[PDB]
Amino acid sequence: VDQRTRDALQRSVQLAIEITTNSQEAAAKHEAQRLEQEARGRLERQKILD
Amino acid sequence: LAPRNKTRVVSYRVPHNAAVQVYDYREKRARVVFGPELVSLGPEEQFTVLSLSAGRPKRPHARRALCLLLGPDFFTDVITIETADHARLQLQLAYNWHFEVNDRKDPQETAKLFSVPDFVGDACKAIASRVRGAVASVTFDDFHKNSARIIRTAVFGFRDQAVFPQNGLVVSSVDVQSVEPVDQRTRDALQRSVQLAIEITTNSQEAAAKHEAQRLEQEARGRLERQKILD
Amino acid sequence: LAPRNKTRVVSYRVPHNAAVQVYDYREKRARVVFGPELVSLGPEEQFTVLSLSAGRPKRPHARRALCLLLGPDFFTDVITIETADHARLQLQLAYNWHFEVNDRKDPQETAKLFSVPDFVGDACKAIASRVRGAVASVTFDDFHKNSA
Ligand SMILES: NC(=O)c1ccc[n+]([C@@H]2O[C@H](COP(=O)([O-])OP(=O)(O)OC[C@H]3O[C@@H](n4cnc5c(N)ncnc54)[C@H](O)[C@@H]3O)[C@@H](O)[C@H]2O)c1
Ligand SMILES: NC(=O)c1ccc[n+]([C@@H]2O[C@H](COP(=O)([O-])OP(=O)(O)OC[C@H]3O[C@@H](n4cnc5c(N)ncnc54)[C@H](O)[C@@H]3O)[C@@H](O)[C@H]2O)c1
């Protein structure tokens, strides 16, 4: 019935949206770090062989 | 228009996949006429007028009808629901329906088609209640990525058709068309999310290009050093 | 235009790959006429008028028709869908379709062609619902590289 409860629920849903976006960003960052580490290791081994 | 001749026998042409109900108030006998047949009223018979539901939000008493159409059709309703995260979002569904008349010569089963005064609004409100009940216990993200399965499981059960035994009406399928959040701020947040996803993809491609360039540079440097040693 | 002669037998020329439904309300007998044949109404028969869907977004009740075309055709619709990354993107599809009439002499199977009041809108909305449901669980990049 009250508008203030609706406002609170709107803030809750916006926080949930922010949570989802932050989760996707963290997953992308972790994948990028893994790929960078793999590339660095391969480069170091190739330097040793050279 | 042109006034009818009151002394002429009143007649009506039932369409294909349709039926009418008339009761002979004098001889005390009801009948349901099926198919494309032509129905002529007796001196005391009457037509069972049906007041149904229609409109974008399916308001009641918006379409008076004389014959009941019992062929494969569909009606669409706009359902507003809320998720477990309290995100308000409205739907647009389509309900494929048809009447299952096992025996067209049965005075009891055929009378059941007109038993429900308004099958359209009844079915729409029942399915809307089912969908609203099932969704409210589901978060916004899971519903967004799985709305089809959630809605199909909500409307039906554990089942391919949502049969209504009051009149024989069955809903053989549901087709969700649009799922849009009611509030603009949720749309803005989702736009920011999609822009961040685009940025993620571009950054990934840039990192891959940089790694390949570094590998090629290292290979060239090694070959150059070996050639210098040989020289 | 020029008013028709009401006393003349009403006739219609069904095109190739088309059919009509007429019911003789007096003799109580329906029939579906196929092919390029010419259909003449009896004193009490009527034509089954079909109200179909048409337009760029496929609005309903935009094309009234008298004969049903059952030959290889296609209709196009504009579908707006959303990805798992919440990226809004609209589509333009084309649906190659045709009616499979196993027996043109069967009073039951041939009557099934006119069973659905509007096949165009029904098929368009069903396929749009399928496409929208499948895409929503797919990220934007995977859909972009593999939309087909
Ligand atoms: N197979 C198909 O896809 C198919 C078949 C028939 C009709 N259609 C069309 O799909 C459209 C859906 O539009 P909408 O639902 O947004 O419009 P709407 O909400 O105004 O339609 C109300 C519903 O009531 C039903 N209805 C109307 N008159 C009736 C009668 N005399 N007896 C029994 N039922 C009756 C119709 O089937 C319709 O689905 C309908 O207008 C219909 O013409 C589709
Ligand atoms: N093989 C082919 O590629 C092929 C074959 C026939 C027609 N076409 C043409 O492709 C075009 C596609 O255009 P659109 O879909 O954007 O226009 P649209 O959306 O206005 O077309 C509506 C659809 O309804 C169908 N239709 C029209 N009148 C009909 C009737 N009396 N009975 C049954 N079905 C009927 C048409 O095939 C059309 O695809 C059609 O106009 C058609 O002329 C292509």
Side-chain angles (χ1 to χ4, degrees):
Chain A
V1 182
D2 209 7
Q3 188 64 42
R4 306 200 204 66
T5 309
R6 191 76 278 174
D7 302 343
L9 297 167
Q10 289 177 3
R11 283 169 277 172
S12 166
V13 79
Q14 96 175 2
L15 292 171
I17 293 165
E18 296 175 357
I19 282 159
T20 307
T21 70
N22 296 325
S23 173
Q24 95 160 357
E25 183 175 3
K29 184 178 74 66
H30 289 100
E31 191 63 28
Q33 289 172 355
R34 178 183 77 94
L35 289 187
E36 188 179 9
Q37 166 53 43
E38 189 178 6
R40 187 174 300 108
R42 281 181 298 180
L43 183 64
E44 302 302 324
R45 177 142 184 286
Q46 219 56 32
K47 288 185 181 179
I48 290 306
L49 300 179
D50 292 341
Chain B
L1 222 34
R4 76 184 183 99
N5 206 15
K6 310 277 190 68
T7 82
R8 283 300 180 100
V9 163
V10 183
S11 179
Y12 185 75
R13 289 173 298 188
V14 190
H16 306 78
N17 284 320
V20 292
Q21 204 190 26
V22 305
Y23 183 65
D24 197 7
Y25 283 87
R26 174 188 295 167
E27 298 296 330
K28 303 293 186 286
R29 214 181 321 91
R31 56 194 174 102
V32 172
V33 187
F34 277 110
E37 272 254 355
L38 171 143
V39 170
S40 62
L41 296 187
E44 288 299 327
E45 304 193 354
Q46 297 297 321
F47 281 122
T48 297
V49 178
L50 300 174
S51 179
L52 298 175
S53 305
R56 176 84 282 168
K58 288 283 175 180
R59 65 187 183 279
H61 306 297
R63 177 164 299 172
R64 301 183 66 85
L66 207 74
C67 86
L68 171 83
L69 301 172
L70 49 96
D73 281 41
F74 79 84
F75 35 77
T76 58
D77 203 9
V78 179
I79 316 303
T80 304
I81 60 178
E82 206 159 5
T83 45
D85 316 332
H86 302 87
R88 279 181 307 167
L89 52 95
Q90 65 177 1
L91 267 64
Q92 288 186 358
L93 303 161
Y95 311 122
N96 281 282
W97 65 272
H98 71 95
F99 271 88
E100 174 76 32
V101 191
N102 292 316
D103 196 356
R104 277 165 158 76
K105 327 194 177 0
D106 202 12
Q108 291 103 344
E109 173 179 0
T110 56
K112 268 214 297 295
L113 315 173
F114 302 84
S115 282
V116 182
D118 174 19
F119 75 98
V120 167
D122 156 40
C124 290
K125 77 159 179 60
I127 289 150
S129 76
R130 295 184 192 177
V131 166
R132 192 215 58 89
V135 166
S137 57
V138 179
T139 166
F140 170 57
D141 202 10
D142 186 19
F143 180 64
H144 164 70
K145 293 180 175 67
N146 288 314
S147 60
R149 189 186 64 254
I150 300 313
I151 290 165
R152 199 258 186 196
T153 312
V155 174
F156 308 100
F158 297 99
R159 291 185 287 189
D160 286 328
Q161 55 194 359
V163 54
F164 292 153
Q166 272 173 343
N167 52 6
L169 160 68
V170 311
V171 168
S172 56
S173 89
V174 60
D175 291 322
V176 47
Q177 298 166 0
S178 171
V179 179
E180 208 259 328
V182 182
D183 209 7
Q184 188 64 42
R185 306 200 204 66
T186 309
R187 191 76 278 174
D188 302 343
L190 297 167
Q191 289 177 3
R192 283 169 277 172
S193 166
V194 79
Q195 96 175 2
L196 292 171
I198 293 165
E199 296 175 357
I200 282 159
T201 307
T202 70
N203 296 325
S204 173
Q205 95 160 357
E206 183 175 3
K210 184 178 74 66
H211 289 100
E212 191 63 28
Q214 289 172 355
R215 178 183 77 94
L216 289 187
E217 188 179 9
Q218 166 53 43
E219 189 178 6
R221 186 174 300 108
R223 281 181 298 180
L224 183 64
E225 302 302 324
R226 177 142 184 286
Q227 219 56 32
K228 288 185 181 179
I229 290 306
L230 300 179
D231 292 341
Chain C
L1 222 34
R4 76 184 183 99
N5 206 15
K6 310 277 190 68
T7 82
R8 283 300 180 100
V9 163
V10 183
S11 179
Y12 185 75
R13 289 173 298 188
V14 190
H16 306 78
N17 284 320
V20 291
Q21 204 190 26
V22 305
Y23 183 65
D24 197 7
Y25 283 87
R26 174 188 295 167
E27 298 296 330
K28 303 293 186 286
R29 214 181 321 91
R31 56 194 174 102
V32 172
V33 187
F34 277 110
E37 272 254 355
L38 171 143
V39 170
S40 62
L41 296 187
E44 288 299 327
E45 304 193 354
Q46 297 297 321
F47 281 122
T48 297
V49 178
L50 300 174
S51 179
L52 298 175
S53 305
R56 176 84 282 168
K58 288 283 175 180
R59 65 187 183 279
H61 306 297
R63 177 164 299 172
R64 301 183 66 85
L66 207 74
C67 86
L68 171 83
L69 301 172
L70 49 96
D73 281 41
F74 79 84
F75 35 77
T76 58
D77 203 9
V78 179
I79 316 303
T80 304
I81 60 178
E82 206 159 5
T83 45
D85 316 331
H86 302 87
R88 279 181 307 167
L89 52 94
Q90 65 177 1
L91 267 64
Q92 288 186 358
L93 303 161
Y95 311 122
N96 281 282
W97 65 272
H98 70 95
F99 271 88
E100 174 76 32
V101 191
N102 292 316
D103 196 356
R104 277 165 158 76
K105 327 194 177 0
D106 202 13
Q108 291 103 344
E109 173 179 0
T110 56
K112 268 215 297 295
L113 315 173
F114 302 85
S115 282
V116 182
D118 174 19
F119 75 98
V120 167
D122 156 40
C124 290
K125 77 159 179 60
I127 289 150
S129 76
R130 295 184 192 177
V131 166
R132 192 215 58 89
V135 166
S137 57
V138 179
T139 166
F140 170 57
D141 202 10
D142 186 19
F143 180 64
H144 164 70
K145 293 180 175 67
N146 288 314
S147 60

